[PDB]
Write a protein that binds this ligand. Structure first.
Ligand code: NAD
Ligand code: NAD
Lengths: 374, 374
């Protein structure tokens, strides 16, 4: 066994912005106290992993990205009580220390031990567990799942059902939960409402599922890629609009279609202009708009505060407002109970070594989610 | 006696921006169907009246401003059923038609018949009941209370308790209800929370009373005018901070004082910069910030969407989120039962004729609410 030993394995390293991932041989240190080393089984390619490449999302490079995954505990550090060697786990990019003021708040989920607000790319102790060619490589959001093995803090891992299909439930580690929770826990979509979902990638289709689950009467998917419409309709959208077909701004189209605005809108792209558009297209007196997409680093949007003064609510959330450690295991149980379906989001499955082809798929608009298997 | 006839009376006409009000003779036409002519008893000077003068708030000039008032029904037009001559009433700048999509919505209050969104400055049928110097004069939010008599649509009037003290319950027509409701109905302030209130004018002091009524444990008042602190303390502020005393930006002071940010923040001034500061000083994961202040017309603020993505909620509302015709009568009844105090808001009581001095008091920071009496 590898317990207690430095593991040599392959990982996808991003050495510099706007380059393909380089599949390298890396050394994965053994887990210190309160850390878990996991053997990766499957990882999804999420737009947020692409944001690191594109420089949209700023985090120390070089880096092993990937945060939407599912693996098996290989070994645990000293003091680890929550998982054992052998357990199926999902690494959590939003930790749940269970102690800070947020973890104690009934509603919040943005644990103060996150590595999200100002990414350091280190373990909780400020060190890396990864070296490549002698150089220390940064972690990504405490997860770094584009690697055969990764080391995560105990606060960033959830034990799930031993029978879960790891190549499906890897989407619970981000995409699906984010989307679904965004509609059901964050916006709290109501029965009979009209919803507008901007962006129909994996997180957007999950927002659609959540809206359909909460009973939205009408779910308008909006995307500039008309090939995403059939899948959107398949998971619940009632109509799909493409902004480029109209001579009118899409907030006007949506307002006219919904008779003065939708109840709930969601920005699931990451563009400043669509965030303001999504806010705008919601009903002025009682509409709720939720930002889910991640926008370019250090860029501000410009908006007229009168949009909010009339009564609109504008909110954002990380990971669909779910308290990670408590919810991931329940979402898996729920998936195991057929309460929701993850297959419709999986368009492609590729061996890990074809990570770059998986990113070209995403970038080209041909895939929803590509699951990488190890 | 004046019923069915034109009344010649005095009213404060604003002929053009940034000029003092002109006290002069106006002709007030009798009510048409579904209209009510009211004899004014008292009207308060609100910052939003001052916005009309300054050009901040755009509405057709010339105009008879004033919206926070109480009076007695002098007469009614055909079809009027909810009020009768002699009733004590409060004119409603936010109507309650009781019929549109918003009136029907459980939460909304921004009635689709408002004259707020794109001010026409007329009655609901598109005409004015006022003539001055031989010219038609515009209404102001379907109220126009700076006149001895005014005419309002039935949907813009609530009948109040026959025993109510009109010189005090005119504040229920705007300032008090807006502040109070922003805390209890819009933000939905929780027992034990920490709240920060930016701006300690009439409206902000009412927000502090709502916060105290909701059970806030800590209410921090923020104002650049330290003379407002004593009064804020008296109505419930636990602490008051003047951003000019500190070397760091106030959001940082506020975040530190509240150990990571307040639960609820209210912007009760009308500045773009303080709207963003208010949002920022709320806890990133679960804070809620409510815009109450009215910004300068057509100006956009700039903010970083990451502020919302961690989990914050940003809302605004008009008239504290209260359905106006349902809520006013009940707030007056609560007042009559001493459920809240109005007295602390009233610093000055002046005859109508000294409206310009009343505006000067406001403009110089010496007053909270000045009530004009007729
Ligand atoms: N808030 C969170 O916790 C969280 C979790 C996961 C991902 N995200 C973010 O959610 C967004 C969605 O992720 P994804 O993986 O679903 O992405 P994706 O790239 O799969 O989907 C984006 C979709 O937006 C559409 N789109 C792009 N530009 C558009 C434009 N100008 N107008 C209309 N439609 C447009 C694309 O065509 C595509 O269908 C990304 O910004 C990602 O970083 C945030
Ligand atoms: N949303 C609504 O329905 C509604 C209804 C009522 C009034 N309003 C708006 O609410 C605001 C408050 O009205 P009011 O009558 O209480 O006003 P006010 O002028 O009496 O009070 C504003 C307070 O803000 C303080 N202030 C000004 N500039 C400041 C700065 N840079 N920093 C910190 N504090 C500052 C002033 O010193 C004053 O104490 C206005 O913009 C008014 O138009 C909105």
């Amino acid at each position: 066994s590898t317990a207690g030993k430095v593991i040599k394995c392959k990982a996808a390293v991003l050495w510099e912005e706007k380059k393909p991932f380089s599949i390298e041989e890396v050394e994965v240190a053994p887990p210190k106290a309160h850390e878990v080393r996991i053997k990766m089984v499957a990882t999804g390619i999420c737009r947020s992993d692409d944001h690191v490449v594109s420089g949209t999302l700023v985090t120390p490079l070089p880096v092993i990205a990937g945060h939407e995954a599912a693996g098996i505990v290989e070994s645990i550090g000293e003091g680890v009580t929550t998982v054992r060697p052998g357990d199926k786990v999902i690494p959590l990019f939003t930790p749940q220390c269970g102690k800070c003021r947020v973890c104690k708040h009934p509603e919040g989920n943005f644990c103060l031990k996150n590595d999200l607000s100002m990414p350091r790319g280190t373990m909780q102790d400020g060190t890396s567990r990864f070296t490549c060619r002698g150089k220390p490589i940064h972690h990504f959001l405490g997860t770094s799942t584009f690697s055969q093995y990764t080391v995560v803090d105990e606060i960033s891992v959830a034990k799930i059902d031993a029978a879960s299909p790891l190549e499906k439930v890897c989407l619970i580690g981000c995409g699906f939960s984010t989307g679904y929770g965004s509609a059901v826990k964050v916006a709290k979509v109501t029965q009979g409402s009209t919803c507008a979902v901007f962006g129909l990638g994996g997180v957007g289709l999950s927002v659609i599922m959540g809206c359909k689950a909460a009973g939205a009467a009408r779910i308008i998917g909006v995307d500039i890629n008309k090939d995403k419409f059939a899948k959107a309709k398949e998971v619940g959208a009632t109509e799909c609009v493409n902004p480029q077909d109209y001579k009118k701004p899409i907030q006007e189209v949506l307002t006219e279609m919904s008779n003065g605005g939708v109840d709930f809108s969601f920005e699931v792209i990451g563009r400043l202009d669509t965030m303001v558009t999504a806010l705008s297209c919601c009903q002025e007196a009682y509409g709720v708009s939720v930002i889910v997409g991640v926008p370019p680093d250090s860029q501000n949007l410009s908006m007229n505060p009168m949009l909010l003064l009339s009564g609109r609510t504008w909110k954002g959330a990380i990971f669909g407002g779910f308290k990670s450690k408590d919810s991931v295991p329940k979402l898996v149980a729920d998936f195991m109970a057929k309460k929701f379906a993850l297959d419709p989001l999986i368009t492609h499955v590729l061996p890990f070594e074809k990570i770059n082809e998986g990113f070209d798929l995403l970038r080209s608009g041909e895939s929803i989610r590509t699951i990488l298997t190890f």
